[PDB]
């Protein structure tokens, strides 16, 4: 099997805005997770071909990763903060669907998710 194309990250047929909370999501929340010691499995789409995971895209139909999320934020792809948060949520659940309990990547996801939740508790005020 081939890899699927990566998720869409630019769509100019969607209106664009910058908001306090979206900027914080990019420059603080994502930035903090991105530079964490456990970030790397989540920094790009899963390359099922190079990782020899023929089952990955049989199981995961809504792939998501922080590389995609970053690109979406840079492109003002999200109008609402919650759309971005949802993509983080999807990324974590995909990990818990595909990987077995006890696996290293599950530990890594749980630590990043706890940190994510902490950072989201600190979002600034809405316009």
């Amino acid at each position: 099997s081939m890899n699927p194309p990566p998720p869409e990250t630019s769509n100019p047929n969607k209106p664009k805005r910058q908001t306090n909370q979206l900027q914080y999501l990019l420059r603080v929340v994502l930035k903090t997770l991105w530079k964490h010691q456990f970030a790397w499995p989540f920094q790009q789409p899963v390359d099922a071909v190079k990782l020899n995971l023929p089952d990955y895209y049989k199981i995961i139909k809504t792939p998501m990763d922080m590389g995609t999320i970053k690109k979406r934020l840079e492109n003002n792809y999200y109008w609402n903060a919650q759309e971005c948060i949802q993509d983080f949520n999807t990324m974590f659940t995909n990990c818990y669907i595909y990987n077995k309990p006890g696996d290293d990547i599950v530990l890594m996801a749980e630590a990043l998710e706890k940190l994510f939740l902490q950072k989201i508790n600190e979002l600034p005020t809405e316009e």
Binding site: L53, Y98, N99
Partner: peptide, 12 residues
């Protein structure tokens, strides 16, 4: 679950 990804240098 699928086949998984293997160790990532945390263990074990």
């Amino acid at each position: 679950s699928g086949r998984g990804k293997g160790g990532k240098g945390l263990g074990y």
